Amino acid sequence: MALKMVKGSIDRMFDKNLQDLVRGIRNHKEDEAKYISQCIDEIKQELKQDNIAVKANAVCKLTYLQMLGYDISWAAFNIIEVMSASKFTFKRIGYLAASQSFHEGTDVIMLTTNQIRKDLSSPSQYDTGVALTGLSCFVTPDLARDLANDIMTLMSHTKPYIRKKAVLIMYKVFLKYPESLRPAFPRLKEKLEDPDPGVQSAAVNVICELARRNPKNYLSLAPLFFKLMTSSTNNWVLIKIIKLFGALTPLEPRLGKKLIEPLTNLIHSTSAMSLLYECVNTVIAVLISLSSGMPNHSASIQLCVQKLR
Amino acid sequence: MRILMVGLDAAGKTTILYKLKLGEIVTTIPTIGFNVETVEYKNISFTVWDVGGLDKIRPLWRHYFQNTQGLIFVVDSNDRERVNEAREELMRMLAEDELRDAVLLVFANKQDLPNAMNAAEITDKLGLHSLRHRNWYIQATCATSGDGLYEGLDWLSNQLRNQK
Amino acid sequence: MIKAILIFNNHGKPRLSKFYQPYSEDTQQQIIRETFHLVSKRDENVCNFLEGGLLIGGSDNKLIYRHYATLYFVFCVDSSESELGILDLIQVFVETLDKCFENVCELDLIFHVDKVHNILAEMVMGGMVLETNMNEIVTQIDAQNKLEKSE
Ligand SMILES: Nc1nc2c(ncn2[C@@H]2O[C@H](COP(=O)(O)OP(=O)(O)OP(=O)(O)O)[C@@H](O)[C@H]2O)c(=O)[nH]1
Ligand SMILES: [Mg+2]
């Protein structure tokens, strides 16, 4: 009885971990295929066990072998169990496995949804964000449709971290359901007004991608993006908006016509050479688009070529 | 004690599980996936796995047969038109070789409705008397009021455990 | 945006691989070897801004890479992106790696790739850069570590 548990613990002590696995494959590079086959059989048997921690370390090695490129989808239900553990220290491992291993053509796409809405409903922000990450790398259509009802409120979370991560996962949710976009588009605009700059930027990139895919949704939002740059001070956000406009100016010449002056001022105030080049290229595109009928783009191109020199 | 607990949709599986947990009746949505919780009753810890009862999720019941030590079938007596579908599901489930050495506890739920059918006719309809090599039991249960829960728990612990 | 992030040695052995666009396993390793050929043969004075691969779905994309010693750091991203901005994000990500691992090395990519993946996640998800405040992201990483240690 107790001695059998002691024997199990001793075997666990003689069991390998992810680090033990990597050390072994390093020591057995010549016998790599044989060693990994033996290890995968051991992992199958240790998943046949009921120790959640042993199965979690098995999932660690399985995710590693997934990085080494081997089939572990046979233990997808095991990974489900691991991510369903009461301790988040194993939920991280399970979600990390599922993010790079699960596939929308499988049954995990419907078997898991309860854990997702539980972890999202979980007040502790870390697990909720981790589940959001796992879905961001593994969300399926039925999953996104059934989860958006909660994720939209998650976008209203107290802690901004959940809000940004939720907006970023919502983008892919839109990529699988514009049926969510139609009602959430005003909510996305509202999130664009989150006092925290981070949630702001999350909504910023989401809407930039949305416009990139559908240029039918930015026309009324052009002043919004203008005010959005002007309030924006972060480099990557500024670059993203400027690139959106480089994608929008050929469709609306007047938009670039208005944008050129504040963009020129930004070029005056720009200190990052990376932002400098992007601004230069975008305004060159704008000047090319506008050159029909505005005989002063020569001065702007002159400034641009001073910058290029 | 790993327990796999099954049933049909809108039967009362999740309500029973949460009432077992914390002693309250919770608002329930259809269980598309599954829920897992560990139950400690009579100094014995039970890991009861509530699977979804929907027809669409029924094919995926194969995956949780592993290492399962007990089966529980939440029976909706108010849902008299689905007693058939219940009995074919139970017959197909017991046909699996993986659950040959598990135990089966039957929960005749929804007894508050006046149309509820007694556990004896539940046994007759499900054919529990025809079970061979199978220690089994049946009891009338009520999810909202709780009646019938603890004695079934005592029964399950009685067969599963080997000592006090 | 970002399609995949691949970290590998000078012999093509992986050190960190994360994908964001859907790709089967075999497609993933084929992309890995393709990127290894497209990058590892480049000289150290070759521009870091390379065109994207074909197995990823089109050369319109870009392969932003930076390498040192025997380690290569490539971020598979699409066409509409800021190669310079991607490079700045790579640099700040490496600085965050230094902040979190206390002078991270290859050994950390070998044995601690889980926490490296965690840092990358806090950096980017599904092709979406979550954070560019390096203090803020290291604060999150330490917060998650504190939660893990507490319980
Ligand atoms: N009248 C009555 N209703 C009950 C009883 N037990 C549960 N219910 C109700 O039955 C409905 C379905 O209960 P659930 O627990 O969600 O059913 P389930 O078996 O989990 O359904 P799935 O998740 O689809 O598998 C809910 O409205 C419950 O409140 C009971 O004893 N009497
Ligand atoms: Mg249920």
XYZ file of C-alpha atoms in Angstrom, chain A residues 9 41 56 100 112 119 142 164 175 225 231-232 237 272 274 277 282:
17
model
C 7.636 8.058 -6.136
C 6.271 5.415 -25.299
C 2.220 17.857 -17.002
C 1.176 25.006 -30.970
C -12.649 22.113 -24.371
C -10.759 30.354 -16.997
C -17.491 27.403 -32.990
C -5.516 44.332 -24.159
C -11.304 36.957 -38.464
C -7.440 57.695 -36.781
C -2.788 61.588 -29.077
C -0.508 58.628 -29.780
C 1.415 52.622 -32.824
C 13.630 57.755 -34.457
C 13.071 53.876 -38.071
C 12.041 56.208 -42.997
C 4.368 56.925 -46.695
